[PDB]
């Protein structure tokens, strides 16, 4: 609890909102509203060659093994997101250097999923 914050700024969809918490009671831009909760029970890209999703999801298939030679526009990965599967393609041409992902993994857009050397 000494780590957990009482007040903080939440940026949601372009807007930021000043929050102060104390069922919680919660102050959104100085407007306090009772809330109730019910509980239910990887490298970032340095390179422009570092392949990323721009939207989080789960990996369906890796279409490439380490050391492959790949040209821009090649289907490198597939992801499930928004009730669909769709193929991520290579930003850059060259060699697949690493692969930081396997089938089944959940991804977020700050994560670098493979690397490719130009």
């Amino acid at each position: 609890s000494r780590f957990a914050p009482t007040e903080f700024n939440v940026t949601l969809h372009g807007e930021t909102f000043h929050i102060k918490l104390t069922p919680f009671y919660v102050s959104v831009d100085g407007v306090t509203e009772e809330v109730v909760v019910e509980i239910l029970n990887r490298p970032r890209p340095t390179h422009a060659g570092c392949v990323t999703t721009a939207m989080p999801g789960t990996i369906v298939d890796v279409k490439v093994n380490v050391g492959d030679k790949v040209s821009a526009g090649d289907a490198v990965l597939v992801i499930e997101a928004m009730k669909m599967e769709n193929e991520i393609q290579a930003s850059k041409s060259g060699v697949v250097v690493a692969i930081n992902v396997k089938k089944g993994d959940s991804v977020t857009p700050d994560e670098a999923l493979l690397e490719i050397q130009p």
Partner: protein, 404 residues
């Protein structure tokens, strides 16, 4: 000749006139009660001056407003609308103290303010007037008029104000989607006649009821500017407020009828801080976030701004949103847009309600009369999208429970 004006008004129209004066290279002078200390017109104006601790009385006090006008160095004075605009005494006083009142002479104000003395002038000049058994479910059509001192009188065209609530106007459109070019010509000329009859000068509006049998019947003659002039300024190109000042500075009208031209349609929404779900209860308080609408076809005339605190003593109107397009279909679409385009946090607004109107087919079809609102109560039972200010709280509580 006129170098300084006393905007004898508050809110949104004070801002309009500030804009008009600045355009003409004329110094503007605002007046604020204590409540309107932070009002946008005050910030915007060249000079400002307190008019009392009372919210209202200083604005309706002809004599000390003119003391201020005289003390200030004002050559002329603008009464905007409501308040003292239709009160002859102010003109009389102004005249007396050497101040050009931006309006008609007090005689005509007085004449046309009396219902029975007005009805006589119109009946005399050969103009159909209402019956004691009045008109049933009429379209409310009204014609802008501009007269100068020198006997020139013209009309920019009509405006349809048939969309209204308990005798409060909501949406105004120019020209009417509901009228033939023939009707437009007739009603405009008939308005110019009446105005001439009563030896009018400056900006005025002649209102008519339009019976389901095509009979136009005179009803009022507003001897001032009106909220809904924006819509007519849009379709014609003519700055009306600027003319008012020119007329009062003794200039001749800048345009003959043949030179008055319109294109498109213009629609103006009164963005009141009320909550239609709660029988249009006022929703006074603070506007926390405001982003103004923009891009093509869009004009805003705002009282409000970011952080503005709406005082509770006056009307609910935070801004007039005025939309324009080359035609009926386009306008309505652009309406719908601009309403969403106008982003306002902290206070319940009539926007959602207006979107219901624009959705409804009788309206899109462009056939409607004063009963439309009354005749369609469903318009207030709409989907109230859940506030983004509440979603942010719900998320922040998920983060709190996820950490301690």
């Amino acid at each position: 000749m006129i170098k300084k004006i006393l905007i004898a008004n508050r809110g949104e129209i004070a801002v309009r006139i500030v804009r008009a004066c600045s355009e003409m290279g004329i110094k503007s002078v605002a007046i604020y009660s204590d409540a309107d200390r932070h009002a946008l017109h005050v910030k915007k104006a060249d000079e400002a001056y307190n008019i009392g601790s009372d919210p209202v009385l200083g604005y309706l006090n002809a004599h000390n407003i003119v003391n201020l006008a005289v003390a200030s160095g004002c050559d002329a004075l603008h009464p905007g609308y409501g308040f003292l605009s239709e009160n002859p005494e102010l003109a009389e006083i102004c005249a007396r103290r050497g101040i050009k009142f931006i309006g008609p002479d007090a005689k005509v104000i007085r004449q046309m303010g009396d219902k029975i003395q007005a009805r006589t002038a119109m009946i005399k000049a050969g103009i159909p007037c209402v019956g004691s058994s009045g008109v049933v479910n009429p379209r409310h059509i009204e014609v802008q008029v501009l007269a100068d001192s020198h006997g020139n009188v013209i009309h920019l065209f009509e405006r349809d104000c048939s969309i209204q609530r308990r005798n409060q106007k909501l949406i105004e459109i120019a020209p009417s989607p509901q009228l033939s070019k023939a009707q437009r010509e007739y009603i405009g000329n008939l308005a110019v006649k009446a105005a001439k009859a009563v030896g009018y000068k400056n900006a005025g509006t002649v209102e008519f009821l339009l019976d389901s049998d095509n009979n136009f019947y005179f009803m009022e003659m507003n001897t001032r500017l009106q909220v809904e002039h924006t819509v007519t300024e849009q379709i014609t190109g003519i700055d009306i407020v600027q003319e008012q000042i020119r007329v009062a500075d003794g200039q001749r009208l800048q345009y003959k009828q043949s030179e008055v031209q319109y294109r498109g349609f213009a629609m103006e929404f009164r963005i009141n801080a009320e909550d239609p779900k709660n029988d249009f209860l006022p929703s006074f308080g603070k506007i926390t976030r405001y982003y103004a609408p923009g891009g093509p076809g869009i004009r805003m005339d705002a009282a409000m701004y970011s952080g503005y605190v709406i005082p509770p003593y006056y009307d609910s109107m935070c801004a007039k949103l005025t939309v324009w397009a080359l035609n009926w279909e386009s306008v309505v679409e652009r309406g719908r847009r601009a309403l969403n385009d106008t982003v306002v946090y902290g206070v319940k607004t009539t926007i959602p309600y207006y979107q219901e109107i624009l959705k409804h087919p009788d309206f899109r079809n462009a056939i409607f009369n004063t009963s439309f609102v009354e005749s369609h109560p469903e318009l207030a039972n709409y989907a109230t999208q859940f506030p983004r200010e509440l979603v942010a709280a719900a998320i922040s509580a998920a983060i709190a429970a996820h950490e301690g």
